[PDB]
């Protein structure tokens, strides 16, 4: 053995004599063998202060000796062309490499090699990162990190080997990764770089499995660099199963006596081909049912029994309801700004109830789909001293929610659109949405300020207020010259009814300041309906209106896909009516209807049916304000026609404006010979419109199969009609019948749309084969993502 008296120290600098003592197991007065000393040495390393410790016997004393790790005084960079100094230094601190701490010398190469992977993630394999560690007079060190970032390496081929039923291209078609992306016919068609290939093989598996190739396998996926490490090859070798028809489903496992309800959940009409996604539904439908009856983590697995004789598959589905658990608490770590209710209210797993593997996860998708948090991570911890109690933790990192946004688009009906404004999604972490948006068309200057509560009611009923301003100029909207300087307020409840359905109901006020009204029969028929008798012969006039509305709305969306819908209908219906106490007295009803009906299994041949309906009228023998009129024509309605060109037209009076008639064309001006009334091809639209199109979506047949599905050709037959329902056909006997809708304006044509860098694109070329008297054509039209 050996007995200690004192404990002396050599090489203590930053570490106080106290800090050394508190880590040493062997104390003054103890009796110590050469084994306890190893465990004391062993412990002083475990503190992380020291580079090298040795504990020795000096007669009756125990002598501890240390060389402390050097202290970082500087961290400089020099090379970091793709990564900001502040972003790297923030990551170093994270990993315990911070100025004022010591240097883990055996980790220098670790630090080096630990940053390359960062550069390999983005695809800059040709990279580097050595470190210079400059010693400094008093056991300090300057850490310099010399970066030599490379050329980013691009993916020069994606090959498939073994594909016999489907051209290698058609398959690559549906991948996130591309071996070629176009420009100057540019298609916003993903990048040309490489990472996390896992998941693009999952889409390959599905594409085969979903077409009855049950025995389909991916043999090997090798990945190549070029020696220069600037090109990247990818090969997936596959084995195409023969096509197999489904026979039936044997269910076998810890069913929890629920075979009653599963024996028909695994009932499949015999003859239909194997379908890998209908399997994964079935499997989840079971996990949904076992979750329904308490079980937290129901496992299900399906190994198809293959029979090459008749070529069929008997699907063998193993079940295991497993255990049940109980959620003691649902905790939220991260919410340093957002309120606890703001995340908790987005939960689908109830606390003080039985754990759902789904409802915990569903709770997470519902949490990042808010966009309030950068990262959301779950964590189901079993509560200490309990078999079946758990705590579900959601770790959030909060995102900066406020953002300025600015966008310019270019259409025909619009011209140059300038969307712009500031938005705030999560006001002071309350869920409140405040935003000051404004848009500038050729005809409209609009700008609103919003405040919205997305949960007025705990069940997701939104109560938002809008406060808006709109200066509208009709002779820029290809309409009879008017000017409307409107502004008001609107409070609106939004009811979530159903996964697919929602309702809107609101009370609004509106100020309509009318001015610069060049006379016109239909416009004036409205004006002495309000008890206004202004002048038939000049442009100097005014009409102020103070209205209060009740607005309502229903929206039913079941489109298979947001972007290029292939299946199911959308329907919006937005109407309103004037609450007594208003200067006007009318109601308005507009209904839009789009339907997709695919004819081929691959869904490349969709049939689209669109229908837009409008109707309003006055209640107190008055008429509907002409600014509330319905129009038809342009891209958004009936193509081949000019914007708003469909419907009634102007029947003008003789007059003159303070224009000072120089050398421009005018309509029904005194200067050029004012008889009485002048018919025109100047559109006014009406109070009764009905358009309806039938568009046949097809493949795009001269573009590379690799990305052919990126652009959507279609052929359409468009028809429409507007009419004035209070048009005195009698009194104006000479003038055309604008109470008769019988005149249907039809047109046929071809459409393209894809995504350019300039934004989403949409081209239309239509010949209005059946147009009526004064309809301005416009055969080619387009938009570049007005937004």
């Amino acid at each position: 053995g050996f007995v200690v008296k004192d404990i002396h120290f050599e090489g203590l600098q930053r570490v106080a004599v106290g800090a050394a003592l508190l880590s040493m197991p062997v104390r003054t007065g103890d009796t110590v063998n050469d084994e306890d000393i190893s465990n004391t040495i062993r412990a002083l390393f475990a503190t992380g202060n020291f580079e090298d410790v040795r504990v020795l016997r000096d007669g009756d004393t125990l002598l501890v000796q240390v060389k402390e790790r050097p202290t970082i005084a500087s961290i400089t960079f020099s090379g970091n062309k793709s990564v900001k100094d502040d972003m790297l230094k923030q990551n170093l601190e994270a990993s315990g490499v911070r100025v004022g701490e010591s240097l883990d010398r055996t980790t220098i190469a670790d630090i080096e090699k630990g940053l390359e992977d960062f550069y390999y993630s983005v695809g800059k394999y040709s990279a580097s990162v050595k470190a210079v560690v400059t010693p400094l007079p008093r056991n300090r060190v300057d850490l310099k990190l010399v970066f030599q970032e490379g050329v980013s390496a691009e993916i020069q081929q994606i090959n498939i080997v073994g594909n016999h039923a489907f051209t290698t291209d058609e398959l690559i078609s549906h991948f996130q990764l591309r071996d070629e992306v176009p420009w100057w016919n540019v298609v916003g068609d993903r990048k040309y770089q490489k990472q996390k290939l896992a998941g693009d093989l999952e889409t390959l598996r599905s594409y085969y499995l979903d077409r009855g190739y049950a025995r389909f396998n991916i043999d090997s996926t090798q990945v190549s660099l070029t020696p220069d490490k600037k090109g990247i090859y990818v090969t997936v070798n596959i084995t195409e199963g023969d096509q197999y028809k489904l026979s039936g489903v044997e269910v076998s496992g810890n069913l929890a006596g629920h075979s009653a309800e599963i024996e028909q959940l695994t009932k499949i009409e015999p003859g239909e081909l194997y379908n890998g996604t209908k399997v994964t539904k079935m499997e989840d439908d079971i996990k949904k049912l076992l979750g329904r009856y308490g079980y937290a983590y129901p496992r299900v697995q399906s190994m198809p029994e293959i029979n090459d004789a008749d070529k069929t598959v008997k699907l063998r589905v193993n079940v295991d309801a497993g255990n049940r658990f109980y959620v003691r608490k649902i905790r939220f770590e991260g919410n340093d700004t957002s309120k606890d209710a703001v995340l908790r209210r987005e939960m689908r797993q109830m606390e003080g109830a039985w754990l759902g593997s789904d409802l915990v996860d569903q709770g997470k998708e519902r949490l990042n789909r808010l966009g309030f948090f950068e990262t959301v991570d779950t964590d189901t911890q079993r509560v200490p001293g309990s078999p079946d109690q758990v705590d579900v933790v959601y770790k959030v990192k909060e995102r900066n929610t406020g953002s300025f946004n600015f966008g310019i688009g270019y259409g025909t009906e619009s011209g140059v659109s300038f969307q712009a404004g500031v938005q705030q999604d999560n006001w002071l972490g309350t869920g409140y949405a405040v935003g000051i948006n404004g848009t500038k068309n050729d005809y409209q200057t609009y700008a609103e300020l919003s405040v919205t509560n997305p949960y007025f009611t705990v069940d997701g009923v939104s109560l938002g207020g809008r406060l808006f301003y709109n200066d509208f100029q009709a002779d820029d909207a290809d309409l009879s010259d008017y000017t409307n300087k409107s502004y008001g307020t609107d409070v609106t409840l939004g009811f979530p009814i159903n996964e697919y359905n929602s309702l809107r109901a609101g009370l609004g006020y509106v100020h309509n300041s009318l001015s610069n009204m060049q006379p016109q029969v239909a416009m004036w028929r409205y004006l002495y309906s309000m008890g206004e008798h202004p002048s038939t012969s000049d442009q100097d006039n005014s009409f102020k209106t103070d209205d209060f509305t009740f607005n309502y709305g229903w929206t039913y969306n079941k489109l298979d896909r947001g972007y290029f819908p292939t299946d199911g209908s959308r329907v919006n219906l937005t109407g309103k009516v004037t609450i007594p106490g208003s200067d006007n007295e009318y109601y308005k009803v507009t209904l839009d209807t789009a339907t997709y009906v695919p004819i081929d299994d691959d869904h490349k041949w969709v049939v689209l049916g669109r229908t837009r309906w409008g109707y309003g009228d006055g209640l107190g023998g008055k008429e509907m304000p002409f600014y509330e009129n319905f129009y038809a024509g342009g891209s958004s309605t009936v193509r081949g026609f000019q914007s708003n060109t469909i419907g009634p037209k102007a029947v003008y009076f003789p007059h003159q404006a303070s224009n000072y008639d120089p050398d421009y064309d005018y309509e029904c001006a005194t200067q050029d010979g004012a008889k009485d009334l002048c018919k025109s091809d100047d559109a006014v639209g009406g109070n009764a419109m009905a358009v309806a199109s039938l568009e046949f979506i097809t493949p795009t047949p001269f573009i590379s199969d690799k990305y052919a599905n990126s652009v959507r050709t279609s052929f359409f037959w468009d028809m429409g009609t507007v009419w004035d329902t209070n048009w005195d056909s009698s009194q104006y006997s000479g003038y055309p019948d604008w109470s008769d809708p019988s005149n249907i304006r039809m047109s046929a044509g071809i459409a393209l749309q894809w995504m350019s860098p300039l934004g989403p694109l949409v081209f239309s070329y239509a010949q209005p084969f059946k147009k009526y008297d004064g309809d301005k054509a416009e055969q080619f039209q387009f938009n570049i993502g007005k937004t």
């Binding site: 900066n400 406020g402 953002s403 946004n405 600015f406 966008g407 500031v422 705030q424 934004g759």
Partner: peptide
């Protein structure tokens, strides 16, 4: 993505 700029991560209040 579009012509213009969507400058996210700007302000809280």
């Amino acid at each position: 993505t579009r012509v213009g700029v969507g400058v996210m991560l700007n302000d809280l209040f």
